[PDB]
Amino acid sequence: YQYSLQFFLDIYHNVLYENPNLVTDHTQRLSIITKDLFQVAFNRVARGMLHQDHITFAMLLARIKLKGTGEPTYDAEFQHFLRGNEIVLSAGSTPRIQGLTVEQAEAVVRLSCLPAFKDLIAKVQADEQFGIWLDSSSPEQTVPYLWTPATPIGQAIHRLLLIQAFRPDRLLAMAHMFVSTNLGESFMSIMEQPLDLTHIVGTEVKPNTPVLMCSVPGYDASGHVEDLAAEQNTQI
Amino acid sequence: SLQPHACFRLFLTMEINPKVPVNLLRAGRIFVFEPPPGVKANMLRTFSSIPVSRICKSPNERARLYFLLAWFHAIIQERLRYAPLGWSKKYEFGESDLRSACDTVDTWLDDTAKGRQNISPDKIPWSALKTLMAQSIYGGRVDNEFDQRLLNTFLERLFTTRSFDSEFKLACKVDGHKDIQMPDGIRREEFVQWVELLPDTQTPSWLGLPNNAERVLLTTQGVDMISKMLKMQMLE
Amino acid sequence: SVVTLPVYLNFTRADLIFTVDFEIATKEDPRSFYERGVAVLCTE
């Protein structure tokens, strides 16, 4: 995908003049334009994006929204989340092996450099009753403790860092609910639905702009275009 | 260099290859086709592929068999992701096999139901559909005898339904005190609204796999997302 | 009952070697053993 500037300008031409629930008050209109812009840019990119690359684009959109917000930017925690595996950790330090493995202990050692997560080794032994929420079981819903008054975005970043230190298989679920808390709980729920080819072909596509139909091997879409021409009574 | 008629779209379908030039990728709106993630989204795409006139025909038990065929196609396409435990090879379980299965279902239901609105569930051609799908339609791509045994086990479990009895377990979603039971709706719209009533969370245990089968793989793609971060923030 | 399990050469499971017949327990089911992809790996 090599998007030009005219793709972005066509996105804005679908932003500025296609107003849902069209309000005539500029205070609501600015927020409506911003949310409509973010959602339609995510949709018009993720329609031409593999599913493995969806959550990275959602993470970048959430980061741009956070930097566009007044909001306490936890950019040191962002940097530690973004480069914790490539950073240097300690050598020869052994935390408790009571319910945490060696890799989990090394991740706790790496995470202990954060200022909010400073009393990390005492926290995993003080909360001995929470042997299921932190490690093992299903840590998708419940996350123990916190990072002082903290924002829900900052609490979500602290939960994301705690899960990436503790239970790294549920990292994508944490990223999904971080986008849900940051951008909206139904931000990417359109992408679960099948591709409505008719409206996107008939409205969003310019006549001199071709419709590129990229396919993975083993899953083509020639019959999709055949059915689209059949329902619309057009001859291909 | 050309101005076209307004109501025209040139469709160019191709595989995802490096030999596609970057100028034509710049020129067009790209839409990428993948096997859809999740049983719910796969069954939504399957139900959107089958038209309403085909399923709502006589007899009235056509919709239950179409729902069972959609569930079977969804679980054997979602098992393809968890290789080499879902299937021993990366088969191409596309849409032509599903269309041939639908055609055989329609033809054998027209042969069995002689214009009747309903059939008692003992007289449905179970063995014909089971063998013709296990040996020709979905068994055509099967190499190993153990893959054929797994396909026969899935078809013998799925297509019985205690002769369309209610409270029939489709699978076991959670090993602890949960299962997916057969929806008791007798129409197509009940099946579609039951598909949309599915919880969006899923385990590999939906497909009979152990819950850990995706687990390490999930960790891998989490780190993959972090690796993709090293393409953005290093350039930031 | 008795369950037949293949023996694969490694974890890619692309090289079948031989089959093993195993007795099942008093509470298990053969459909679960056929469904979960229970096999034997020699090189691991």
Side-chain angles (χ1 to χ4, degrees), chain B residues 29-64:
Chain B
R29 291 238 179 177
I30 295 149
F31 305 98
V32 180
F33 266 87
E34 208 206 359
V39 184
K40 177 175 169 194
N42 205 353
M43 266 156 74
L44 269 189
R45 200 217 283 263
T46 296
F47 268 116
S48 98
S49 62
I50 291 154
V52 200
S53 64
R54 194 141 140 191
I55 177 169
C56 283
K57 226 187 219 174
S58 291
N60 283 12
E61 269 68 32
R62 172 99 53 88
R64 320 259 313 264

PDB file of all heavy atoms in Angstrom, chain B residues 29-64:
ATOM      1  N   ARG B  29      -7.470   2.386  -5.609  1.00  0.00           N
ATOM      2  CA  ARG B  29      -7.909   2.000  -4.277  1.00  0.00           C
ATOM      3  C   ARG B  29      -7.775   0.493  -4.119  1.00  0.00           C
ATOM      4  O   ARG B  29      -8.342  -0.275  -4.902  1.00  0.00           O
ATOM      5  CB  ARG B  29      -9.357   2.429  -4.042  1.00  0.00           C
ATOM      6  CG  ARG B  29      -9.555   3.927  -3.950  1.00  0.00           C
ATOM      7  CD  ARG B  29     -10.190   4.310  -2.626  1.00  0.00           C
ATOM      8  NE  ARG B  29     -10.380   5.750  -2.506  1.00  0.00           N
ATOM      9  CZ  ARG B  29     -10.964   6.343  -1.474  1.00  0.00           C
ATOM     10  NH1 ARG B  29     -11.434   5.645  -0.453  1.00  0.00           N
ATOM     11  NH2 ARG B  29     -11.080   7.667  -1.466  1.00  0.00           N
ATOM     12  N   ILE B  30      -7.038   0.076  -3.096  1.00  0.00           N
ATOM     13  CA  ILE B  30      -6.669  -1.318  -2.887  1.00  0.00           C
ATOM     14  C   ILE B  30      -7.633  -1.933  -1.882  1.00  0.00           C
ATOM     15  O   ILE B  30      -7.918  -1.331  -0.841  1.00  0.00           O
ATOM     16  CB  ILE B  30      -5.212  -1.424  -2.402  1.00  0.00           C
ATOM     17  CG1 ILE B  30      -4.258  -0.925  -3.489  1.00  0.00           C
ATOM     18  CG2 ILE B  30      -4.855  -2.844  -2.001  1.00  0.00           C
ATOM     19  CD1 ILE B  30      -3.003  -0.287  -2.949  1.00  0.00           C
ATOM     20  N   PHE B  31      -8.161  -3.115  -2.202  1.00  0.00           N
ATOM     21  CA  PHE B  31      -8.940  -3.911  -1.260  1.00  0.00           C
ATOM     22  C   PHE B  31      -8.343  -5.308  -1.214  1.00  0.00           C
ATOM     23  O   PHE B  31      -8.195  -5.951  -2.257  1.00  0.00           O
ATOM     24  CB  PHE B  31     -10.414  -3.963  -1.662  1.00  0.00           C
ATOM     25  CG  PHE B  31     -11.040  -2.614  -1.827  1.00  0.00           C
ATOM     26  CD1 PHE B  31     -11.172  -2.048  -3.084  1.00  0.00           C
ATOM     27  CD2 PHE B  31     -11.487  -1.906  -0.725  1.00  0.00           C
ATOM     28  CE1 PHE B  31     -11.744  -0.802  -3.240  1.00  0.00           C
ATOM     29  CE2 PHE B  31     -12.060  -0.658  -0.872  1.00  0.00           C
ATOM     30  CZ  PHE B  31     -12.186  -0.106  -2.133  1.00  0.00           C
ATOM     31  N   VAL B  32      -8.016  -5.780  -0.014  1.00  0.00           N
ATOM     32  CA  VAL B  32      -7.273  -7.019   0.178  1.00  0.00           C
ATOM     33  C   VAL B  32      -8.215  -8.075   0.738  1.00  0.00           C
ATOM     34  O   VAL B  32      -8.893  -7.843   1.746  1.00  0.00           O
ATOM     35  CB  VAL B  32      -6.066  -6.807   1.110  1.00  0.00           C
ATOM     36  CG1 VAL B  32      -5.294  -8.104   1.300  1.00  0.00           C
ATOM     37  CG2 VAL B  32      -5.159  -5.720   0.557  1.00  0.00           C
ATOM     38  N   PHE B  33      -8.250  -9.235   0.088  1.00  0.00           N
ATOM     39  CA  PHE B  33      -9.082 -10.355   0.508  1.00  0.00           C
ATOM     40  C   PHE B  33      -8.258 -11.385   1.264  1.00  0.00           C
ATOM     41  O   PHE B  33      -7.201 -11.818   0.792  1.00  0.00           O
ATOM     42  CB  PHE B  33      -9.771 -11.009  -0.688  1.00  0.00           C
ATOM     43  CG  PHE B  33     -11.144 -10.477  -0.949  1.00  0.00           C
ATOM     44  CD1 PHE B  33     -11.335  -9.352  -1.733  1.00  0.00           C
ATOM     45  CD2 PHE B  33     -12.249 -11.093  -0.381  1.00  0.00           C
ATOM     46  CE1 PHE B  33     -12.608  -8.861  -1.956  1.00  0.00           C
ATOM     47  CE2 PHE B  33     -13.522 -10.608  -0.604  1.00  0.00           C
ATOM     48  CZ  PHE B  33     -13.700  -9.490  -1.394  1.00  0.00           C
ATOM     49  N   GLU B  34      -8.753 -11.774   2.428  1.00  0.00           N
ATOM     50  CA  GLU B  34      -8.147 -12.756   3.310  1.00  0.00           C
ATOM     51  C   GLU B  34      -9.251 -13.688   3.777  1.00  0.00           C
ATOM     52  O   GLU B  34     -10.433 -13.329   3.720  1.00  0.00           O
ATOM     53  CB  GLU B  34      -7.479 -12.077   4.514  1.00  0.00           C
ATOM     54  CG  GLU B  34      -6.302 -12.820   5.122  1.00  0.00           C
ATOM     55  CD  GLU B  34      -6.102 -12.492   6.590  1.00  0.00           C
ATOM     56  OE1 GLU B  34      -6.874 -11.668   7.126  1.00  0.00           O
ATOM     57  OE2 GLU B  34      -5.179 -13.060   7.209  1.00  0.00           O
ATOM     58  N   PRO B  35      -8.910 -14.909   4.183  1.00  0.00           N
ATOM     59  CA  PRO B  35      -9.836 -15.704   4.990  1.00  0.00           C
ATOM     60  C   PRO B  35     -10.208 -14.960   6.259  1.00  0.00           C
ATOM     61  O   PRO B  35      -9.323 -14.521   7.008  1.00  0.00           O
ATOM     62  CB  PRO B  35      -9.029 -16.970   5.301  1.00  0.00           C
ATOM     63  CG  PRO B  35      -8.146 -17.129   4.117  1.00  0.00           C
ATOM     64  CD  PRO B  35      -7.845 -15.743   3.596  1.00  0.00           C
ATOM     65  N   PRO B  36     -11.501 -14.772   6.513  1.00  0.00           N
ATOM     66  CA  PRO B  36     -11.932 -13.875   7.592  1.00  0.00           C
ATOM     67  C   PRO B  36     -11.656 -14.470   8.960  1.00  0.00           C
ATOM     68  O   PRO B  36     -11.790 -15.687   9.161  1.00  0.00           O
ATOM     69  CB  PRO B  36     -13.441 -13.728   7.343  1.00  0.00           C
ATOM     70  CG  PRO B  36     -13.818 -14.976   6.638  1.00  0.00           C
ATOM     71  CD  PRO B  36     -12.644 -15.336   5.776  1.00  0.00           C
ATOM     72  N   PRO B  37     -11.260 -13.646   9.927  1.00  0.00           N
ATOM     73  CA  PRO B  37     -10.972 -14.169  11.265  1.00  0.00           C
ATOM     74  C   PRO B  37     -12.246 -14.400  12.055  1.00  0.00           C
ATOM     75  O   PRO B  37     -13.196 -13.617  11.992  1.00  0.00           O
ATOM     76  CB  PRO B  37     -10.117 -13.065  11.897  1.00  0.00           C
ATOM     77  CG  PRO B  37     -10.565 -11.817  11.220  1.00  0.00           C
ATOM     78  CD  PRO B  37     -11.037 -12.191   9.838  1.00  0.00           C
ATOM     79  N   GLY B  38     -12.265 -15.497  12.801  1.00  0.00           N
ATOM     80  CA  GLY B  38     -13.375 -15.755  13.693  1.00  0.00           C
ATOM     81  C   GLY B  38     -14.539 -16.482  13.057  1.00  0.00           C
ATOM     82  O   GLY B  38     -14.885 -16.246  11.892  1.00  0.00           O
ATOM     83  N   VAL B  39     -15.153 -17.364  13.850  1.00  0.00           N
ATOM     84  CA  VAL B  39     -16.291 -18.155  13.397  1.00  0.00           C
ATOM     85  C   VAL B  39     -17.485 -17.258  13.097  1.00  0.00           C
ATOM     86  O   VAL B  39     -18.202 -17.469  12.112  1.00  0.00           O
ATOM     87  CB  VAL B  39     -16.628 -19.227  14.452  1.00  0.00           C
ATOM     88  CG1 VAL B  39     -17.742 -20.133  13.975  1.00  0.00           C
ATOM     89  CG2 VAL B  39     -15.391 -20.040  14.784  1.00  0.00           C
ATOM     90  N   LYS B  40     -17.691 -16.223  13.919  1.00  0.00           N
ATOM     91  CA  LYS B  40     -18.826 -15.319  13.748  1.00  0.00           C
ATOM     92  C   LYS B  40     -18.716 -14.509  12.461  1.00  0.00           C
ATOM     93  O   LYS B  40     -19.679 -14.418  11.690  1.00  0.00           O
ATOM     94  CB  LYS B  40     -18.930 -14.393  14.959  1.00  0.00           C
ATOM     95  CG  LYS B  40     -20.037 -13.361  14.870  1.00  0.00           C
ATOM     96  CD  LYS B  40     -20.145 -12.575  16.166  1.00  0.00           C
ATOM     97  CE  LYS B  40     -21.055 -11.370  16.015  1.00  0.00           C
ATOM     98  NZ  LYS B  40     -20.909 -10.424  17.156  1.00  0.00           N
ATOM     99  N   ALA B  41     -17.539 -13.936  12.197  1.00  0.00           N
ATOM    100  CA  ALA B  41     -17.359 -13.145  10.983  1.00  0.00           C
ATOM    101  C   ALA B  41     -17.343 -14.026   9.740  1.00  0.00           C
ATOM    102  O   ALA B  41     -17.855 -13.627   8.684  1.00  0.00           O
ATOM    103  CB  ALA B  41     -16.076 -12.324  11.074  1.00  0.00           C
ATOM    104  N   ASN B  42     -16.777 -15.232   9.852  1.00  0.00           N
ATOM    105  CA  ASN B  42     -16.783 -16.161   8.726  1.00  0.00           C
ATOM    106  C   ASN B  42     -18.198 -16.619   8.388  1.00  0.00           C
ATOM    107  O   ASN B  42     -18.566 -16.699   7.211  1.00  0.00           O
ATOM    108  CB  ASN B  42     -15.886 -17.358   9.028  1.00  0.00           C
ATOM    109  CG  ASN B  42     -15.361 -18.020   7.775  1.00  0.00           C
ATOM    110  OD1 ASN B  42     -15.756 -17.673   6.663  1.00  0.00           O
ATOM    111  ND2 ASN B  42     -14.457 -18.974   7.946  1.00  0.00           N
ATOM    112  N   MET B  43     -19.015 -16.891   9.408  1.00  0.00           N
ATOM    113  CA  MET B  43     -20.394 -17.290   9.157  1.00  0.00           C
ATOM    114  C   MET B  43     -21.240 -16.120   8.672  1.00  0.00           C
ATOM    115  O   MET B  43     -22.184 -16.329   7.903  1.00  0.00           O
ATOM    116  CB  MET B  43     -20.992 -17.912  10.415  1.00  0.00           C
ATOM    117  CG  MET B  43     -20.876 -19.423  10.434  1.00  0.00           C
ATOM    118  SD  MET B  43     -20.905 -20.121  12.090  1.00  0.00           S
ATOM    119  CE  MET B  43     -22.628 -19.949  12.514  1.00  0.00           C
ATOM    120  N   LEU B  44     -20.912 -14.893   9.090  1.00  0.00           N
ATOM    121  CA  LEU B  44     -21.586 -13.719   8.540  1.00  0.00           C
ATOM    122  C   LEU B  44     -21.280 -13.545   7.058  1.00  0.00           C
ATOM    123  O   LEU B  44     -22.183 -13.261   6.261  1.00  0.00           O
ATOM    124  CB  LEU B  44     -21.185 -12.465   9.317  1.00  0.00           C
ATOM    125  CG  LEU B  44     -22.062 -12.074  10.508  1.00  0.00           C
ATOM    126  CD1 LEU B  44     -21.677 -10.699  11.027  1.00  0.00           C
ATOM    127  CD2 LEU B  44     -23.538 -12.115  10.136  1.00  0.00           C
ATOM    128  N   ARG B  45     -20.014 -13.733   6.667  1.00  0.00           N
ATOM    129  CA  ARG B  45     -19.655 -13.647   5.253  1.00  0.00           C
ATOM    130  C   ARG B  45     -20.279 -14.782   4.446  1.00  0.00           C
ATOM    131  O   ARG B  45     -20.696 -14.578   3.297  1.00  0.00           O
ATOM    132  CB  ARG B  45     -18.136 -13.652   5.094  1.00  0.00           C
ATOM    133  CG  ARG B  45     -17.658 -13.089   3.769  1.00  0.00           C
ATOM    134  CD  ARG B  45     -16.459 -13.856   3.242  1.00  0.00           C
ATOM    135  NE  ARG B  45     -15.226 -13.491   3.928  1.00  0.00           N
ATOM    136  CZ  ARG B  45     -14.348 -12.607   3.475  1.00  0.00           C
ATOM    137  NH1 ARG B  45     -14.536 -11.967   2.332  1.00  0.00           N
ATOM    138  NH2 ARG B  45     -13.250 -12.359   4.186  1.00  0.00           N
ATOM    139  N   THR B  46     -20.359 -15.979   5.037  1.00  0.00           N
ATOM    140  CA  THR B  46     -20.999 -17.113   4.373  1.00  0.00           C
ATOM    141  C   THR B  46     -22.492 -16.875   4.170  1.00  0.00           C
ATOM    142  O   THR B  46     -23.022 -17.119   3.079  1.00  0.00           O
ATOM    143  CB  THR B  46     -20.755 -18.385   5.187  1.00  0.00           C
ATOM    144  OG1 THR B  46     -19.351 -18.671   5.213  1.00  0.00           O
ATOM    145  CG2 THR B  46     -21.489 -19.572   4.587  1.00  0.00           C
ATOM    146  N   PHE B  47     -23.181 -16.370   5.199  1.00  0.00           N
ATOM    147  CA  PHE B  47     -24.607 -16.084   5.080  1.00  0.00           C
ATOM    148  C   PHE B  47     -24.872 -14.913   4.142  1.00  0.00           C
ATOM    149  O   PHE B  47     -25.935 -14.854   3.516  1.00  0.00           O
ATOM    150  CB  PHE B  47     -25.202 -15.804   6.459  1.00  0.00           C
ATOM    151  CG  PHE B  47     -25.766 -17.021   7.135  1.00  0.00           C
ATOM    152  CD1 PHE B  47     -25.218 -17.489   8.319  1.00  0.00           C
ATOM    153  CD2 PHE B  47     -26.849 -17.692   6.592  1.00  0.00           C
ATOM    154  CE1 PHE B  47     -25.738 -18.608   8.948  1.00  0.00           C
ATOM    155  CE2 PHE B  47     -27.374 -18.812   7.214  1.00  0.00           C
ATOM    156  CZ  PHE B  47     -26.816 -19.269   8.394  1.00  0.00           C
ATOM    157  N   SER B  48     -23.927 -13.977   4.032  1.00  0.00           N
ATOM    158  CA  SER B  48     -24.069 -12.911   3.047  1.00  0.00           C
ATOM    159  C   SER B  48     -23.809 -13.416   1.635  1.00  0.00           C
ATOM    160  O   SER B  48     -24.323 -12.839   0.670  1.00  0.00           O
ATOM    161  CB  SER B  48     -23.122 -11.758   3.371  1.00  0.00           C
ATOM    162  OG  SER B  48     -21.937 -11.842   2.598  1.00  0.00           O
ATOM    163  N   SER B  49     -23.007 -14.476   1.491  1.00  0.00           N
ATOM    164  CA  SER B  49     -22.745 -15.025   0.164  1.00  0.00           C
ATOM    165  C   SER B  49     -23.964 -15.757  -0.390  1.00  0.00           C
ATOM    166  O   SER B  49     -24.273 -15.643  -1.581  1.00  0.00           O
ATOM    167  CB  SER B  49     -21.534 -15.956   0.212  1.00  0.00           C
ATOM    168  OG  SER B  49     -21.774 -17.062   1.062  1.00  0.00           O
ATOM    169  N   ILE B  50     -24.660 -16.509   0.450  1.00  0.00           N
ATOM    170  CA  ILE B  50     -25.862 -17.223   0.015  1.00  0.00           C
ATOM    171  C   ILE B  50     -27.025 -16.235  -0.051  1.00  0.00           C
ATOM    172  O   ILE B  50     -27.301 -15.554   0.948  1.00  0.00           O
ATOM    173  CB  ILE B  50     -26.176 -18.375   0.964  1.00  0.00           C
ATOM    174  CG1 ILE B  50     -25.124 -19.477   0.838  1.00  0.00           C
ATOM    175  CG2 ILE B  50     -27.561 -18.935   0.691  1.00  0.00           C
ATOM    176  CD1 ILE B  50     -24.979 -20.321   2.084  1.00  0.00           C
ATOM    177  N   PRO B  51     -27.712 -16.122  -1.187  1.00  0.00           N
ATOM    178  CA  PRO B  51     -28.843 -15.194  -1.279  1.00  0.00           C
ATOM    179  C   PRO B  51     -30.035 -15.673  -0.462  1.00  0.00           C
ATOM    180  O   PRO B  51     -30.141 -16.841  -0.082  1.00  0.00           O
ATOM    181  CB  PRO B  51     -29.168 -15.176  -2.775  1.00  0.00           C
ATOM    182  CG  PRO B  51     -28.672 -16.484  -3.281  1.00  0.00           C
ATOM    183  CD  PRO B  51     -27.461 -16.820  -2.459  1.00  0.00           C
ATOM    184  N   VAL B  52     -30.933 -14.726  -0.180  1.00  0.00           N
ATOM    185  CA  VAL B  52     -32.091 -15.006   0.663  1.00  0.00           C
ATOM    186  C   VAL B  52     -33.094 -15.904  -0.052  1.00  0.00           C
ATOM    187  O   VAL B  52     -33.796 -16.694   0.590  1.00  0.00           O
ATOM    188  CB  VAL B  52     -32.742 -13.686   1.120  1.00  0.00           C
ATOM    189  CG1 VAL B  52     -33.605 -13.910   2.355  1.00  0.00           C
ATOM    190  CG2 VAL B  52     -31.676 -12.635   1.394  1.00  0.00           C
ATOM    191  N   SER B  53     -33.183 -15.799  -1.382  1.00  0.00           N
ATOM    192  CA  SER B  53     -34.151 -16.597  -2.130  1.00  0.00           C
ATOM    193  C   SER B  53     -33.785 -18.076  -2.146  1.00  0.00           C
ATOM    194  O   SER B  53     -34.677 -18.931  -2.204  1.00  0.00           O
ATOM    195  CB  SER B  53     -34.272 -16.067  -3.557  1.00  0.00           C
ATOM    196  OG  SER B  53     -33.052 -16.214  -4.261  1.00  0.00           O
ATOM    197  N   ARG B  54     -32.490 -18.397  -2.099  1.00  0.00           N
ATOM    198  CA  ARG B  54     -32.066 -19.793  -2.128  1.00  0.00           C
ATOM    199  C   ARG B  54     -32.389 -20.506  -0.821  1.00  0.00           C
ATOM    200  O   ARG B  54     -32.831 -21.660  -0.830  1.00  0.00           O
ATOM    201  CB  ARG B  54     -30.571 -19.877  -2.423  1.00  0.00           C
ATOM    202  CG  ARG B  54     -30.090 -21.265  -2.799  1.00  0.00           C
ATOM    203  CD  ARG B  54     -29.057 -21.202  -3.905  1.00  0.00           C
ATOM    204  NE  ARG B  54     -27.976 -22.156  -3.692  1.00  0.00           N
ATOM    205  CZ  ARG B  54     -26.846 -22.171  -4.384  1.00  0.00           C
ATOM    206  NH1 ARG B  54     -26.614 -21.296  -5.348  1.00  0.00           N
ATOM    207  NH2 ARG B  54     -25.924 -23.086  -4.101  1.00  0.00           N
ATOM    208  N   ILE B  55     -32.176 -19.838   0.311  1.00  0.00           N
ATOM    209  CA  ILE B  55     -32.338 -20.500   1.600  1.00  0.00           C
ATOM    210  C   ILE B  55     -33.811 -20.550   2.018  1.00  0.00           C
ATOM    211  O   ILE B  55     -34.252 -21.529   2.636  1.00  0.00           O
ATOM    212  CB  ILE B  55     -31.436 -19.803   2.642  1.00  0.00           C
ATOM    213  CG1 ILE B  55     -31.600 -20.404   4.042  1.00  0.00           C
ATOM    214  CG2 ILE B  55     -31.656 -18.295   2.644  1.00  0.00           C
ATOM    215  CD1 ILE B  55     -30.560 -19.930   5.026  1.00  0.00           C
ATOM    216  N   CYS B  56     -34.607 -19.552   1.640  1.00  0.00           N
ATOM    217  CA  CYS B  56     -36.001 -19.470   2.065  1.00  0.00           C
ATOM    218  C   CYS B  56     -36.946 -20.295   1.200  1.00  0.00           C
ATOM    219  O   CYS B  56     -38.166 -20.176   1.360  1.00  0.00           O
ATOM    220  CB  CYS B  56     -36.461 -18.010   2.078  1.00  0.00           C
ATOM    221  SG  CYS B  56     -35.881 -17.051   3.496  1.00  0.00           S
ATOM    222  N   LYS B  57     -36.426 -21.121   0.296  1.00  0.00           N
ATOM    223  CA  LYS B  57     -37.255 -21.962  -0.554  1.00  0.00           C
ATOM    224  C   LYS B  57     -37.849 -23.118   0.248  1.00  0.00           C
ATOM    225  O   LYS B  57     -37.516 -23.344   1.413  1.00  0.00           O
ATOM    226  CB  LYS B  57     -36.440 -22.498  -1.726  1.00  0.00           C
ATOM    227  CG  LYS B  57     -37.129 -22.399  -3.071  1.00  0.00           C
ATOM    228  CD  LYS B  57     -36.314 -23.111  -4.137  1.00  0.00           C
ATOM    229  CE  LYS B  57     -36.335 -22.361  -5.454  1.00  0.00           C
ATOM    230  NZ  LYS B  57     -35.419 -22.987  -6.446  1.00  0.00           N
ATOM    231  N   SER B  58     -38.755 -23.852  -0.388  1.00  0.00           N
ATOM    232  CA  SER B  58     -39.222 -25.104   0.182  1.00  0.00           C
ATOM    233  C   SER B  58     -38.100 -26.138   0.124  1.00  0.00           C
ATOM    234  O   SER B  58     -37.353 -26.187  -0.858  1.00  0.00           O
ATOM    235  CB  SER B  58     -40.447 -25.616  -0.575  1.00  0.00           C
ATOM    236  OG  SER B  58     -41.573 -24.789  -0.342  1.00  0.00           O
ATOM    237  N   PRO B  59     -37.950 -26.979   1.152  1.00  0.00           N
ATOM    238  CA  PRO B  59     -38.747 -27.092   2.381  1.00  0.00           C
ATOM    239  C   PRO B  59     -38.280 -26.164   3.494  1.00  0.00           C
ATOM    240  O   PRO B  59     -37.277 -25.471   3.361  1.00  0.00           O
ATOM    241  CB  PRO B  59     -38.548 -28.556   2.763  1.00  0.00           C
ATOM    242  CG  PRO B  59     -37.127 -28.826   2.348  1.00  0.00           C
ATOM    243  CD  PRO B  59     -36.898 -28.009   1.100  1.00  0.00           C
ATOM    244  N   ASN B  60     -38.989 -26.160   4.623  1.00  0.00           N
ATOM    245  CA  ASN B  60     -38.694 -25.250   5.723  1.00  0.00           C
ATOM    246  C   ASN B  60     -37.482 -25.666   6.547  1.00  0.00           C
ATOM    247  O   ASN B  60     -37.026 -24.878   7.382  1.00  0.00           O
ATOM    248  CB  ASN B  60     -39.914 -25.127   6.639  1.00  0.00           C
ATOM    249  CG  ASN B  60     -40.983 -24.227   6.059  1.00  0.00           C
ATOM    250  OD1 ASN B  60     -40.928 -23.855   4.888  1.00  0.00           O
ATOM    251  ND2 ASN B  60     -41.966 -23.872   6.879  1.00  0.00           N
ATOM    252  N   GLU B  61     -36.955 -26.871   6.348  1.00  0.00           N
ATOM    253  CA  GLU B  61     -35.761 -27.318   7.050  1.00  0.00           C
ATOM    254  C   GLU B  61     -34.487 -27.041   6.265  1.00  0.00           C
ATOM    255  O   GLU B  61     -33.424 -27.551   6.632  1.00  0.00           O
ATOM    256  CB  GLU B  61     -35.864 -28.810   7.372  1.00  0.00           C
ATOM    257  CG  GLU B  61     -36.484 -29.109   8.727  1.00  0.00           C
ATOM    258  CD  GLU B  61     -37.959 -28.758   8.791  1.00  0.00           C
ATOM    259  OE1 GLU B  61     -38.644 -28.858   7.752  1.00  0.00           O
ATOM    260  OE2 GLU B  61     -38.433 -28.385   9.884  1.00  0.00           O
ATOM    261  N   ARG B  62     -34.580 -26.263   5.184  1.00  0.00           N
ATOM    262  CA  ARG B  62     -33.402 -25.894   4.407  1.00  0.00           C
ATOM    263  C   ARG B  62     -32.476 -24.978   5.200  1.00  0.00           C
ATOM    264  O   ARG B  62     -31.247 -25.100   5.113  1.00  0.00           O
ATOM    265  CB  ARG B  62     -33.847 -25.227   3.104  1.00  0.00           C
ATOM    266  CG  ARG B  62     -32.739 -24.611   2.274  1.00  0.00           C
ATOM    267  CD  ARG B  62     -32.328 -25.540   1.157  1.00  0.00           C
ATOM    268  NE  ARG B  62     -33.475 -25.967   0.368  1.00  0.00           N
ATOM    269  CZ  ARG B  62     -33.948 -25.306  -0.680  1.00  0.00           C
ATOM    270  NH1 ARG B  62     -33.394 -24.180  -1.094  1.00  0.00           N
ATOM    271  NH2 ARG B  62     -35.004 -25.790  -1.329  1.00  0.00           N
ATOM    272  N   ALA B  63     -33.052 -24.069   5.994  1.00  0.00           N
ATOM    273  CA  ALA B  63     -32.259 -23.077   6.713  1.00  0.00           C
ATOM    274  C   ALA B  63     -31.418 -23.698   7.822  1.00  0.00           C
ATOM    275  O   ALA B  63     -30.299 -23.235   8.069  1.00  0.00           O
ATOM    276  CB  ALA B  63     -33.171 -21.994   7.286  1.00  0.00           C
ATOM    277  N   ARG B  64     -31.929 -24.735   8.493  1.00  0.00           N
ATOM    278  CA  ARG B  64     -31.148 -25.416   9.523  1.00  0.00           C
ATOM    279  C   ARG B  64     -29.933 -26.115   8.927  1.00  0.00           C
ATOM    280  O   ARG B  64     -28.831 -26.054   9.488  1.00  0.00           O
ATOM    281  CB  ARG B  64     -32.021 -26.423  10.270  1.00  0.00           C
ATOM    282  CG  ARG B  64     -33.426 -25.942  10.565  1.00  0.00           C
ATOM    283  CD  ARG B  64     -33.552 -25.484  12.004  1.00  0.00           C
ATOM    284  NE  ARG B  64     -32.972 -26.445  12.933  1.00  0.00           N
ATOM    285  CZ  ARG B  64     -33.668 -27.372  13.578  1.00  0.00           C
ATOM    286  NH1 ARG B  64     -34.976 -27.485  13.424  1.00  0.00           N
ATOM    287  NH2 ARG B  64     -33.034 -28.203  14.400  1.00  0.00           N
TER     288      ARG B  64
END
